[PDB]
């Protein structure tokens, strides 16, 4: 049944398994192998090994990891241990197999051997991201991780959206709400048709408005409408854009905002129609609560 292949490849290219709960992650791990060994037709070799390394990461997340060593042994055969995926995989393997930090130094000089472009730039970009992930745990927690990213970011690799997105997340978590607008604007700049960076760039403006003055509140809510209308224009059943437009227009409640309220209520009742699954429960509550 190739629909399982569709689900697995969507999880793959979205990397949604990172955001999985342990129960659904266990379900993913259990239902992976049956198709992995049963439905072996029409599946290319590259997808075969991509599924293998997804299973490697799922096992490493999971409690038991002897199968992680087994899977790494099976996948070592092609392209050895010089590919960036393999380097990251074995670094994680040595980090978790004994809870020893040593891998970082055997990675560190490796980054200092990649300056001569022996591999692609995405390779040691990914290695830099992983070593920052290592070092934020080596010194358990600090704001300096953002500084590390910035010094790794600004000179070396502006283009990468992921770094700016993590900077914006850290700024939004407890930091300033203003620099996050700049970071999200850049993420919008690199990826033109991102329809979830407009929802975040409207939510951050809404959060910045709730502690502002009345004229600044009006300006920020106007900008939130002008940024949420693009999440409306780039997707129809996008839940968060419609909910945010409805919420801010309800907060204002003007006549043409009342027109937008009627339209957004109709669209949120369309979303909460039972075609969509488990997004009805977060739309209907916001609809019928107030």
């Amino acid at each position: 049944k190739d629909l399982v292949r569709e689900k697995l490849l969507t999880i793959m290219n979205t990397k949604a398994y990172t955001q999985f709960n342990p129960e659904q992650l266990l379900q993913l791990e259990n239902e992976m192998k049956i198709y992995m060994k049963s439905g072996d037709s029409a599946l290319t070799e590259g997808n075969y090994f991509f599924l293998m390394e997804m299973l490697f990461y799922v096992l490493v997340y999971r409690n038991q990891d002897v199968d992680a060593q087994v899977v790494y042994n099976t996948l070592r055969d092609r392209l050895g241990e010089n590919s960036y995926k393999m380097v990251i995989m074995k670094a994680t393997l040595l980090q978790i197999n004994g809870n020893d930090k040593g891998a970082i130094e055997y990675l560190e000089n490796l980054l200092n051997d990649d300056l001569e472009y022996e591999t692609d730039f995405v390779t040691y970009v990914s290695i830099a991201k992983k070593l920052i992930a290592i070092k934020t745990t080596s010194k358990n927690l600090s704001q300096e991780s953002v500084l590390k990213e910035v010094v790794a970011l600004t000179d070396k690799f502006p283009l990468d959206a992921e770094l700016w997105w993590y900077a914006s997340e850290i700024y939004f978590e407890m930091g300033q709400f203003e620099k996050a607008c700049y970071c999200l604007e850049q993420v919008l700049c690199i990826t033109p048709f991102n329809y979830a960076c407009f929802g975040r760039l409207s939510e951050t403006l809404y959060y910045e408005a709730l502690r502002s003055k009345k004229q600044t509140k009006t300006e920020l809510l106007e900008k939130a409408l002008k940024n949420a209308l693009r999440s409306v224009e780039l997707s129809e059943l996008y839940l968060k854009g419609w909910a945010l437009v409805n919420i801010i227009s309800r907060e204002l409640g003007r006549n043409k905002q009342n027109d937008l309220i009627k339209l957004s209520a109709s669209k949120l009742k369309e979303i909460s129609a039972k075609s969509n699954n488990k997004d009805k429960i977060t739309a209907e509550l916001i609809l019928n609560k107030i």
Partner: protein
């Protein structure tokens, strides 16, 4: 019997069938042997998995 314009209806009594089959078999085996190399090498190296 005479053939003023040459014999073009009946093909030949000296047609080289074996050389043609040898050419076809050489092309078939060289394709069948070179396919795994290009497939594995380029598809697994271009994505850097």
């Amino acid at each position: 019997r005479i053939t003023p314009s040459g014999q073009f209806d009946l093909m030949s009594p000296t047609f080289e069938k074996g050389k043609l089959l040898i050419t076809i078999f050489v092309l078939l085996v060289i394709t069948y042997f070179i396919r795994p190399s290009v497939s594995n090498k380029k598809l697994k190296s271009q994505w850097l998995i």
